[PDB]
Amino acid sequence: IPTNFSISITTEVMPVSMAKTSVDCNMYICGDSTECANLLLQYGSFCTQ
Amino acid sequence: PFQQFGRDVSDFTDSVRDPKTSEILDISPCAFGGVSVITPGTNASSEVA
């Protein structure tokens, strides 16, 4: 049977959020070229998704 | 003096020496991004931000 006590304090680090990133595929791919964007629009609405 | 062009980590031209007189820096990126639409509700009213 214990005869005394010991008030201890422990720590626990848990992530609850991450870096809110936003990548514009219209600027990442086909930055300013018009024909590049016209060819990209043929592949479908991947950037919207 | 021997350097003419200047790129970034993403291999994008960030600054270049002016070819003619008055050698100064050059292009910085412009404004871009995804415009978001704030609507309080169609049944409520027709205003939008």
Curated annotation (Swiss-Prot), chain A:
Glycosylation sites: 4
Source taxon at top rank: Viruses
Job description of the protein: Mediates fusion of the virion and cellular membranes by acting as a class I viral fusion protein. Under the current model, the protein has at least three conformational states: pre-fusion native state, pre-hairpin intermediate state, and post-fusion hairpin state. During viral and target cell membrane fusion, the coiled coil regions (heptad repeats) assume a trimer-of-hairpins structure, positioning the fusion peptide in close proximity to the C-terminal region of the ectodomain.
Official protein name in the record: Spike protein S2
UniProtKB/Swiss-Prot annotation, chain B:
Gene name of the encoded protein: S
Name of the featured protein: Spike protein S1
Organism domain of life: Viruses
Residues linked to a glycan: 43
Role this protein plays: Attaches the virion to the cell membrane by interacting with host receptor, initiating the infection. Binding to human ACE2 and CLEC4M/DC-SIGNR receptors and internalization of the virus into the endosomes of the host cell induces conformational changes in the S glycoprotein. Proteolysis by cathepsin CTSL may unmask the fusion peptide of S2 and activate membrane fusion within endosomes.
Boundaries of the shown chain within the full protein: 547 to 595 of 1255
Biological classification of the source: Viruses, Riboviria, Orthornavirae, Pisuviricota, Pisoniviricetes
